[PDB]
Ligand binder design. Structure first.
Ligand SMILES: Nc1ncnc2c1ncn2[C@@H]1O[C@H](CSCC[C@H](N)C(=O)O)[C@@H](O)[C@H]1O
Ligand code: NA
Lengths: 265, 265
């Protein structure tokens, strides 16, 4: 009958919306993927208990190569749901799956859930001031990604904040920490020498957004690069020019150095 | 001793998270504000019933001028909830309320919910390609603001998408339509001649995000300017150059003309 893309939220099984839970509980088949992000405060068991259904977990290969062969066929005679961490269509390629649904003659609906993209609002940074976003990918082999460095540069030049999604290798259970992202950025800085990311750069770290006590820290790279921000997932933000109110929140809530209050207008 | 900032989500009373609802139910006092935005798909009465607690509504002045006299005193000896549409702190001024909480010796926690910032992912446009965001405001008397026009120009310039919030008179329950926003943008173009927004500009309109049946339309201004997109709230997006996958989604899901596949990619 129909296919539902339902977000599970930021941290635990309760970050799903009431709308999402009520709809998920009535579906005949429930699929899910847990490779696009990490929900550090729950387990498949708890999610299954809350929804009261067995969930078939799909790999990136199952989705990217066989979504129309695994999920869509059932969505023809049944109500099917496809669950994902955070919001289904944020920093994923899942939107394209709706195109496959259409071609397969399957109607699809989207149920949103809290997302890291908007959750960054808890850092006190004005969300409208964010510019282009990027992802810090783990170097592999002789391939060392560095494009995210240029994104930061372009944004900072315009006084905009840069949100940096951090890498994740779900199968290896590897989640990139803000510390690793900073290390990589310093290395890129040495090669490019654009003066974009140095030990004196002010950065912001948000770890485990969604939990009741996420880690929110702001400060210079030289002081934060070896700080313990707790378990993943983490996101790194490189702010552009700060408004006084943003600085005030970073100081009061994120433990930032009180000197950033002095904005060089 | 605890204050909870809880997001209500995008459209109706079921858009709050399970975590947000359960926490609100265990709170001694539940406050709410509807001056930053409105919940178009529901009513105070319906939200009040779902939570099963009397909800005290606060005006902009109640919050901005007297938050520490109305809400904080109670949170000193009780568990208090402060409900807001969307995701807490996405509204710029609310972040500062956490500082007021701190100075009153009150702990505060944030319970996230979907925001239009992440919800726009449903347009098929890549979230990372969005640039600086802006709000389109109605001219008045001798005042004609046009800042939002320059934001579109700077983003598009760099191949980034521009998310445009449309004017809302929360208290008067009046919404600016995408049609009105397009008319205004054409006026600004006529005045600035930047070639930023014209009859040939491709735009995307998202109406009632959060609803199971939102309106997602994409096309050129000349064709959409007088189209009916349904009841508010309306969100207008001026895409930067598209990735073929974005274009395909707009055509297949948003009813965009095949033309965009060659003109806007
Ligand atoms: N709760 C959380 N706290 C901190 N970072 C998070 C996070 N959830 C996701 N991320 C960040 O985003 C990356 C996944 S990108 C997929 C995001 C998802 N669709 C959403 O809407 O949130 C992670 O590697 C991490 O860097
Ligand atoms: Na943005």
């Amino acid at each position: 009958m129909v296919l539902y893309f339902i977000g599970l939220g930021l941290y635990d099984e309760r970050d799903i919306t009431v709308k999402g839970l009520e709809i998920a509980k009535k579906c005949d088949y429930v699929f899910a993927e847990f490779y696009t992000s990490l929900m550090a405060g729950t387990t498949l068991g708890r999610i299954q208990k809350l929804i009261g259904k067995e969930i078939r977990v799909l790999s990136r290969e199952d989705v990217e190569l066989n979504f129309e062969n695994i999920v869509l066929p059932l969505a023809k005679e049944n109500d099917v749901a496809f669950l994902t961490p955070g919001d289904p269509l944020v920093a994923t390629t899942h939107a394209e799956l709706r195109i496959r649904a259409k071609r397969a003659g399957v109607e699809s609906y989207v149920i949103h859930a809290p997302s890291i993209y908007s959750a960054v609002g808890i850092t006190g940074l004005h969300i409208y001031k964010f510019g282009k976003s990027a992802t810090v990918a783990y170097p592999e082999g002789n391939w060392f990604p560095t494009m995210y460095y240029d994104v930061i540069k372009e944004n900072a030049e315009r006084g905009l904040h840069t949100l940096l999604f951090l890498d994740i290798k779900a199968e290896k259970r590897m989640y990139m920490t803000a510390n690793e992202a900073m290390e990589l950025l310093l290395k890129v800085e040495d090669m490019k020498k654009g003066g974009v990311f140095t030990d004196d750069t002010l950065v912001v770290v948000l770890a485990r957004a969604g939990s009741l006590n996420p880690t929110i820290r702001a400060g210079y790279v030289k002081d934060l690069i070896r700080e313990d921000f707790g378990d993943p997932p983490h996101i790194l933000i490189v702010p552009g020019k700060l408004h006084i109110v943003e600085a005030e929140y970073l100081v009061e809530i994120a433990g930032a150095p009180r000197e950033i209050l002095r904005v060089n207008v």
